[PDB]
Structure formats: C-alpha cells, structure tokens
Amino acid sequence: KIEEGKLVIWINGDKGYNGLAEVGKKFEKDTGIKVTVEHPDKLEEKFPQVAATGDGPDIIFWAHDRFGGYAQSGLLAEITPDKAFQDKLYPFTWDAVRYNGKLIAYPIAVEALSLIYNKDLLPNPPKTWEEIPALDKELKAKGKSALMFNLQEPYFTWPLIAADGGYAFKYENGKYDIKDVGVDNAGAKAGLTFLVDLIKNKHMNADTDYSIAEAAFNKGETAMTINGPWAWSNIDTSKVNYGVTVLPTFKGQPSKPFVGVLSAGINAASPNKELAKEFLENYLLTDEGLEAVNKDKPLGAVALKSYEEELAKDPRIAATMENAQKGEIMPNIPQMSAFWYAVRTAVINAASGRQTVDEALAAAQTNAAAEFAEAALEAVRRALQEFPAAARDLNVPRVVPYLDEPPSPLCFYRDWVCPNRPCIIRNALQHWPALQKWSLSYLRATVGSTEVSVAVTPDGYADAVRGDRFVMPAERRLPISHVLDVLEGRAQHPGVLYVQKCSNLPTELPQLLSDIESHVPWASESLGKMPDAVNFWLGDASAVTSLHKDHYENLYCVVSGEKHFLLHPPSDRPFIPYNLYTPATYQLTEEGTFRVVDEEAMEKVPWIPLDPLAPDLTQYPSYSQAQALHCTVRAGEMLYLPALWFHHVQQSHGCIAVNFWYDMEYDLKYSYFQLMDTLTRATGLD
Numbered sequence: 001k002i003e004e005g006k007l008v009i010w011i012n013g014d015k016g017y018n019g020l021a022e023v024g025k026k027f028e029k030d031t032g033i034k035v036t037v038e039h040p041d042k043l044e045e046k047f048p049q050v051a052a053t054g055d056g057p058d059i060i061f062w063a064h065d066r067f068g069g070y071a072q073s074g075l076l077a078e079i080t081p082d083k084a085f086q087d088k089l090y091p092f093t094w095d096a097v098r099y100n101g102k103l104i105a106y107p108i109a110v111e112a113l114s115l116i117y118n119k120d121l122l123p124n125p126p127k128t129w130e131e132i133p134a135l136d137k138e139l140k141a142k143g144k145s146a147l148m149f150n151l152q153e154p155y156f157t158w159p160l161i162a163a164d165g166g167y168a169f170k171y172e173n174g175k176y177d178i179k180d181v182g183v184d185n186a187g188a189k190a191g192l193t194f195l196v197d198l199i200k201n202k203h204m205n206a207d208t209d210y211s212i213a214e215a216a217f218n219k220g221e222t223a224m225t226i227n228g229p230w231a232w233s234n235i236d237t238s239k240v241n242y243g244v245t246v247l248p249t250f251k252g253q254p255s256k257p258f259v260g261v262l263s264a265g266i267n268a269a270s271p272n273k274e275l276a277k278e279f280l281e282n283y284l285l286t287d288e289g290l291e292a293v294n295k296d297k298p299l300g301a302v303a304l305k306s307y308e309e310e311l312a313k314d315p316r317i318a319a320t321m322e323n324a325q326k327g328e329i330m331p332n333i334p335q336m337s338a339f340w341y342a343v344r345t346a347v348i349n350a351a352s353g354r355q356t357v358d359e360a361l362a363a364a365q366t367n368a369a370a371e372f373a374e375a376a377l378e379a380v381r382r383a384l385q386e387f388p389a390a391a392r393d394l395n396v397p398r399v400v401p402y403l404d405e406p407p408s409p410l411c412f413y414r415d416w417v418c419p420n421r422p423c424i425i426r427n428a429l430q431h432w433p434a435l436q437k438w439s440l441s442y443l444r445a446t447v448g449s450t451e452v453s454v455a456v457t458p459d460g461y462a463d464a465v466r467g468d469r470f471v472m473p474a475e476r477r478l479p480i481s482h483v484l485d486v487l488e489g490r491a492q493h494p495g496v497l498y499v500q501k502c503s504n505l506p507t508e509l510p511q512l513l514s515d516i517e518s519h520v521p522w523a524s525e526s527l528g529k530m531p532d533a534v535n536f537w538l539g540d541a542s543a544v545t546s547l548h549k550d551h552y553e554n555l556y557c558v559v560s561g562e563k564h565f566l567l568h569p570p571s572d573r574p575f576i577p578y579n580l581y582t583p584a585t586y587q588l589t590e591e592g593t594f595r596v597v598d599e600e601a602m603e604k605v606p607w608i609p610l611d612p613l614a615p616d617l618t619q620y621p622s623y624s625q626a627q628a629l630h631c632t633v634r635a636g637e638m639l640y641l642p643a644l645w646f647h648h649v650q651q652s653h654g655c656i657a658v659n660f661w662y663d664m665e666y667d668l669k670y671s672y673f674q675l676m677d678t679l680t681r682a683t684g685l686d
C-alpha cells in the first residue's frame with residue numbers, strides 16, 4: 001500500500017503516444033512504476049511555464065529546436081550517458097541536443113517533410129511548384145484539388161519560403177549567424193508570394209489547417225499533401241495508394257525544409273530523474289522500444305543506429321532523408337521560438353490578405369530582431385550572473401587562510417598575489433618595537449604635540465553615499481594628544497574621529513618610523529617595487545570605512561587592537577551594485593554642525609550604496625548571491641588584501657595599525673575587470 005513513484009511523460013498528439021504507452025507498460029511490468037504518457041495541447045508552451053515553479057512532467061518530448069530555451073531557463077537536467085550508449089546513436093543527433101557544450105536531451109528521431117502524393121490520381125508527381133496550378137485546374141475539371149497542407153503552422157510553409165533565399169539565422173560553413181537573419185529577403189518574399197498566389201487563384205484555401213488537409217488527402221479529395229512521417233500510419237489505414245517523395249522545386253532550387261530531431265528532455269525539477277534515464281536509455285531507445293512507438297506513428301529516421309539500419313530501406317524514409325539533406329537542421333537556440341512566432345503571423349496574414357507579402361515579412365523580420373536582441377542581452381546577463389559562483393568554485397577560497405611565518409617572495413607571488421587571494425601572515429611583525437611600545441600613553445609622550453590631519457564625520461562613515469551624494473569626511477588639524485583625549489573619554493569632539501590616510505615620513509610623523517619598517521622587504525622583493533605609501537592608522541570604534549575597492553596591493557598590519565574586514569572578490573562585481581554620485585565633503589562649523597558641501601568641478605564618482613552589514617535586499621536583491629569572506633586581523637598580524645578586492649573595515653576602540661600600499665600590476669586581470677564592470681552597467685545589472 002503506497003502513494004508512490006511515478007513517471008509522467010508529455011508528447012505531442014501527432015506522435016505515437018500509444019506506442020509509447022506500451023513501452024511504458026513493459027517498464028511497469030519490470031519495476032512497479034506506473035508510466036503515464038499525456039498529449040496536452042500547447043505542451044511545448046506549457047512546459048517552460050509550469051516546470052519553473054516545480055510542477056510539470058518528468059519527461060518532455062519535442063522537436064529539438066525548443067530545447068535550448070528550456071536550458072537557458074534551466075528547466076532541463078543534464079543527461080549523462082555511457083559512451084557505449086553515445087556511440088549507439090548517430091553523432092549529429094547528439095549535436096542537436098547539445099546547448100552551450102552540454103547534453104540536454106536524448107535524441108529519438110530525425111524528421112523532415114516530404115511530398116505525399118496519390119499514385120492513383122497522380123502517377124507522376126510534379127517536380128516543380130510551378131506545375132501545381134496547371135495541375136490543379138486540370139484536376140478540378142475531374143472533381144478534386146491538387147495540393148492541400150497545413151497553412152496555419154509556418155513549419156509546412158517554410159520549405160518553399162526558404163527555397164529561393166529565405167533563411168532563419170544563417171547556416172554558412174561552421175554554424176549559425178544570429179546577426180544574419182533572412183526572413184524578409186527577396187527569396188523569402190518569392191516563395192511566399194507564390195504561396196499567396198496559389199490561394200488567390202483558389203488552388204488552395206487560406207483557412208486550411210492540419211486536420212482539414214489530412215482528412216482531404218486520405219479521402220482522395222486532394223492529389224498531394226505535404227507532411228512528415230507521423231502522418232503515414234493514418235494513410236496506411238486509409239487505402240489511398242500513396243507515395244512519398246522529394247519536395248517540388250521553386251525557381252530551379254530545392255525546397256529547404258527545417259529538419260527536426262524529436263528529443264526527450266528530463267525535467268530538472270523532477271523527483272524521478274534516474275527512473276527517467278532507466279526508461280529512455282534502456283526501454284525506449286532500443287530496437288524493441290522504438291519499434292512499439294513506430295508501429296503506432298512512424299518516427300522517421302531513428303537516432304538508434306541498430307534500428308535505423310533495419311528500416312532505412314523504406315522508400316518513405318529514404319525520401320525523408322533526401323529532403324532532409326536538401327534542407328537544413330534547425331538550431332536549438334532559444335531564439336528559435338520567437339522566429340516561429342514571427343513567421344507564423346507573417347504567413348497567416350499574407351495568406352488571408354490582411355497584409356501584403358512584402359509587409360508581413362518586413363514586420364516579422366523587425367519584430368523578431370527586437371526579441372533576438374533582448375534574448376541576446378539575457379544570455380549575456382546569465383553569463384555575468386553565473387560567473388561569480390563559477391570563479392570562487394575554482395580559485396577563491398571561502399576563508400582567509402593563515403600563514404604561520406612570512407612566505408618566500410616566490411611563494412608569496414605564486415600562492416597569493418597572482419591568483420589574487422588574500423591571507424593573514426603571522427609572526428611577521430615581531431621584530432617591530434611598535435608591538436611592545438605603542439601604547440596610547442607612549443604615543444602621547446612621543447607624538448602628542450604633533451599636528452595631524454584628522455578625519456571628522458558625524459556618524460563614523462567616511463567616504464559613503466549619503467542620500468544623493470558621495471560624501472567625504474570633514475578635515476580638522478589637531479595634535480595627536482587631543483585625538484587621544486577624545487578616544488579615552490578625557491575630552492569631547494563633534495562627530496567621530498580617526499586619523500586620515502602618508503604618515504611616516506610624509507606628514508610628517510617620523511618619530512615612529514624607527515618603531516616600524518619603511519616597507520615589508522619580502523613583499524617588496526616579491527612585487528618588485530617599494531610601497532607608494534606607508535600610512536599610520538588610529539581611530540574611534542565607530543569609524544566604519546564603507547565597501548570599496550583599491551588599485552593597490554595593501555598589506556594591512558595591526559599593532560594594537562583588532563580589525564574586522566568584510567571582503568568580496570573582484571569576481572562578485574556583477575552582484576555588487578554601483579551608482580554614480582555627485583562628490584561632496586563635510587563642512588564642520590564652530591557649532592559642531594556637519595553640513596554636506598558639493599565638491600565643485602569634480603567628476604561624478606562611482607560608489608557602492610549597498611551596506612553589507614545590513615543590505616537592502618529589496619532594492620538590491622542580486623547581492624544575496626554574492627559571497628562575503630570574513631576575517632579579523634589582530635596585534636602582531638598582517639592581512640594581505642589583494643588589488644581590486646572589495647573590502648569594508650571596522651575596528652575595536654583605539655585600534656592602531658600600519659598599512660603599506662604597493663601599486664598593483666596593471667595586467668590581464670585588471671583589463672578583464674574593466675570589461676566586466678562595463679558589461680555589468682550596460683546590461684543594467686547595476
């Protein structure tokens with residue numbers, strides 16, 4: 001007694017779904033699993049709707065041209081076959097179910113349209129489209145019509161349109177040019193004008209759909225129809241003496257029918273992926289499985305070599321193969337879908353007489369171009385959005401790792417600087433007398449009277465976006481001793497203090513340099529250069545440097561206290577919002593009042609509005625797919641904070657620190673970063 005495992009399949013209702021049912025049974029007799037196959041209308045439109053919310057079928061059958069869109073939306077699981085299995089099916093059938101180098105369905109059958117004619121009514125079928133009108137009035141004058149076929153789905157009409165120059169995209173040597181779309185060129189117009197003239201001269205009827213045609217030919221009311229393999233069973237059971245042959249030519253050139261590979265995709269949202277594989281690989285794609293479907297509705301030229309070889313001597317299949325060679329295989333790109341919609345209306349309008357042929361096709365080219373554009377953009381968006389996770393999976397570790405001693409210059413460059421990952425180096429500052437000497441008492445006896453440039457801000461956030469402005473801190477020149485007073489509580493000051501950022505010898509502040517080093521020698525030998533700056537850092541515990549990135553190799557050394565960093569690799573850029581801001585600077589008056597004051601004749605300054613501590617996920621939801629790294633640097637410790645790394649600094653009260661700025665190498669890594677940042681803004685990711 002259960003409510004248990006199942007396998008539901010969607011397949012179009014012109015295909016042998018009863019044959020597929022039987023195969024479903026032999027499954028259900030060899031496991032307990034009930035296999036139910038369904039043929040809903042517009043199943044290929046329903047699937048991408050319903051499968052994203054998690055519902056939908058387990059397996060979907062359709063011509064392969066639909067299967068790329070399904071994969072661009074991530075609805076199709078990757079199929080993983082043995083190679084004893086991949087060499088069981090023809091190679092080009094696998095290539096039709098390959099999106100962005102990856103397999104997304106199992107190929108079932110290769111199908112193309114052919115000219116089905118009534119051998120009793122028409123002993124020698126026409127070789128040209130141009131004969132058909134002549135042939136029609138000769139047959140109306142015997143009580144029937146010459147040619148009938150579905151005029152409601154562009155798939156049937158397209159072999160003629162493409163004959164004299166029509167083409168979707170462009171399949172010149174190598175593969176498809178998605179800039180070169182050709183649905184409103186001379187040759188497209190020619191075939192379509194011909195189709196429309198057939199209707200005009202009442203050789204055909206614009207209202208004719210699939211069902212009207214099939215019924216007509218199978219009753220012997222039409223000498224010729226145009227259909228694919230699935231249609232043959234219903235004529236065999238009718239008793240029209242019929243043949244299947246090469247499509248007639250137009251203006252001396254062959255009809256070019258888009259070739260379709262019936263494919264089975266697996267629903268990425270299925271709880272049954274592995275039974276789906278046991279069903280298709282080992283029950284359907286067999287001589288036994290394809291036979292049971294084919295007995296119902298002929299599949300065409302199958303993908304399974306074994307059973308393809310056993311059937312290929314059917315003149316109906318040979319003819320199918322002939323027309324497929326004269327035609328071109330459909331691309332599976334997600335642009336296929338809007339292409340069909342565009343031509344569907346183009347044909348339906350030109351045949352009904354609503355628009356001329358020359359405008360219907362013009363409209364279809366224009367409107368399909370506009371979608372082909374937005375589709376391109378979305379493909380770019382995903383590339384940029386899947387990139388950040390792709391990167392950190394490969395190089396960027398989720399923690400800042402510690403070294404127990406300084407690395408060799410070689411090892412420092414090969415392990416950290418070139419791969420652009422941070423680390424904390426230990427036991428590298430123990431030769432600094434600063435580590436023992438630098439007390440807020442020794443600093444007061446040593447540089448207490450020395451006047452420095454001090455950063456004043458109302459809320460502790462220097463260089464942050466405040467409303468519509470990027471605001472820089474107020475500057476006040478104070479001795480260090482009264483910086484220390486305000487920090488120990490002994491005195492008071494408007495806002496939040498912290499010492500600004502070139503001291504140790506260019507401020508000046510030279511009495512401390514002897515307590516430190518002018519550079520990190522193993523770092524300098526590694527980067528092949530001296531630091532551009534050496535900065536002394538002292539400040540309030542409310543000073544929060546906001547999220548930004550530097551064009552410098554920064555060695556952050558902590559002498560007393562702690563430093564709390566929140567890092568993001570340059571890779572996380574597509575998910576880090578950037579805006580453009582009017583640059584300002586705080587003015588502090590002798591009232592303790594902070595006023596925002598636009599920086600005159602400065603360029604707009606790009607900055608990150610996002611607050612990584614408490615992010616507005618409503619305004620910036622994309623940021624929740626970034627991956628922050630956290631570390632804490634403390635007394636005696638040195639953080640290597642690579643170039644272009646997004647960082648956000650906090651510290652304990654009265655934290656003292658020295659940091660070296662080496663200029664970065666402007667290299668391939670930099671140039672790529674500019675490219676991404678630019679593509680992030682163009683594609684409106686922000």
Ligand SMILES: OC[C@H]1O[C@H](O)[C@H](O)[C@@H](O)[C@@H]1O
Binds near residue numbers: 155
């Ligand atoms: O409506 C036209 C359709 O007819 C058949 O189902 C073909 O398999 C499919 O490729 C074609 O698109």
